[PDB]
Symmetry: C3
Subunit: 246 residues, 3 copies
């Protein structure tokens, strides 16, 4: 059994909504440390890694370490009942359901049946990325949306002093550019001129959970996967690994 | 002829919108006291009783007592043209149309044809309810929406010290609970342990017109109709009687 | 080549969105004075005349006078990427594309291909209007929407001391009236009692670009076109000429 409590139910709902666009079923592992979940999208192109440490919860009691399998759409639909100011309680007793309770002026408790999800057969290659870019959330969210207007593919180019996202359709073309003079670009570390391209329909989902003022970390390499990392409630970490399009 | 004037056209529009989800055609009776309307939904499961006393109108002149029949959808579509700060004037001369005028920076006058509506052949049984619950509007609106996620039916249970709404679908389940310790519960009077169940699709419409901070009165009995009462502009009263599902 | 810069990208987007509801392809002529565009809708019922003087731009450099042909839907889709606080830059080099750049925390540059648009074979008759009405934007926007509820046609009537818009459907009817006592009516000049009627589906698009507090000028005549003029950023001028319905 466990009980974990999170203040601000909507914010937790938004996090599961983000992940649920990419992931249909996920194993969430509860330990004394926090909650972890690792899962691939249906095309097996994006890996999601979510870490929610104890410190982001108001009360956190994991009496025994336990992994539960969750339908993400169903989980999202329930969480969406939560208000911005609801307190959210997730509690598991021995039965195969998760109790999900919202506390405000009343106590409203849902029962979500759990499912059997087989955990990832992980064979991640070494990822010797050659470029790291830290940019403001707003730039990345804007840029992806700009590129989706234009193409189904977006190219990322990192050079010593500039980060460029470029996309080209039949008719239209966009280029989003960033040098260290721009407010949007917080850090750029480039070992070597680095270029790779990615499917935008994945990127469009990945960036939905980003706040405008978030620092977002990108790590990538030449025709290599993109690693995209950002924080949830400062200490929670949401990490995507996205296969390249080439 | 009559002329009644209501300050804040949108608020009047919202009231007719609420009722129009359940009622297609209604007889509104204008007297010196105020306006009354009583009507059943098309399934003959919900009775609506609306009372709008003189005191909620800025100017109120009913020269002769008169009942008019109104298509509610049409009435709603026109009222929806009104702005939050429009003044609304309803005036009837001898012709079979209602003049509906919005006054702001201009005077905009609609003509709504009236129709012949046969008034209710009322045979209401005695309703010896055994439970009264007064709760905050927000709890009832939340709870119904929670239950609609889960089921087409909702069960209400009232005991001496707790009010519970419960719903169960194929897969999901919710329970909304209230004791006198909760802010949501303002009054509970229970003669006898009381249980009844109701169609949620009716309840979902009934609660649309409720403000978050409204006191809502429920009266019900074992496998008996639910009476749901709340106020409009403090002195206007909107009362539903809803047949049980059993 | 030219470069013109406009502070507040959304506001420019809203202007092109307004025009794009009526106009599919337009020739924009850039001179030292400002930008002008004149075009007819596909039914050849509405003429649009837009004038954007230098003074509404933050920086304005037109090195050579040049006319470019623009697909308005495409232009609108790109401009819609702009934020309220983006700076917008339109720049043309010798190639047949317009560069459209949004500058905020990053610099985002789109390429829009240009097209060949044959310029208007203008034979405008003399328009001896007999009525001028200056009214508040809010009244005109409300009134058109009121009339569209009711009919596909709206009649405008101007007399010495009153302006009336009237519409009549099968069942419903509206009348929007204005005398100089109303706040909505800023100026009325009538040579002669003046009546004309117009298609509302045109008027509904024409009024979308009007702010609530705008002074809007109407000039019309008996069974004559309506001239509707209002300002953009105080000095830019948007003028429609709309053929009568009779």
């Amino acid at each position: 059994p466990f009980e974990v409590v999170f203040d601000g139910a909507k914010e937790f709902a938004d996090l599961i909504a983000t992940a649920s666009n990419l992931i249909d079923e996920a194993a969430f592992k509860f330990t004394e440390e926090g909650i972890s979940m690792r899962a691939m999208d249906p095309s097996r192109v994006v890996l999601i890694d979510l870490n929610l440490p104890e410190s982001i919860f108001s009360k956190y009691e994991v009496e025994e370490p336990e992994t539960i399998g969750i339908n993400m759409d169903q989980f999202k639909k329930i969480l969406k009942r939560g208000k911005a100011k609801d307190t959210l309680i997730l509690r598991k007793g021995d039965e195969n359901f998760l109790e999900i309770t919202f506390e405000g002026t009343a106590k409203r408790t849902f029962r979500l049946p759990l499912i059997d999800v087989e955990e990832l057969e992980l064979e991640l290659p070494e990822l010797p990325f050659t470029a790291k870019v830290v940019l403001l959330g707003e730039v990345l969210k804007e840029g992806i949306k700009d590129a989706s207007l234009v193409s189904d593919a977006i190219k990322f180019i990192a050079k010593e002093n500039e980060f460029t996202m470029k996309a080209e359709g039949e008719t239209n073309e966009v280029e989003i550019r960033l040098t260290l003079e721009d407010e949007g670009l917080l850090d750029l570390e480039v070992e070597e001129e680095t270029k790779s391209a990615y499917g935008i329909r994945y990127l469009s989902d990945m960036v939905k959970g980003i706040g405008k003022a978030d620092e977002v970390i990108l790590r990538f390499g030449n025709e290599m996967p993109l690693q995209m990392e950002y924080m949830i409630r400062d200490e929670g970490r949401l990490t995507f690994l996205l296969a390249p399009r080439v």
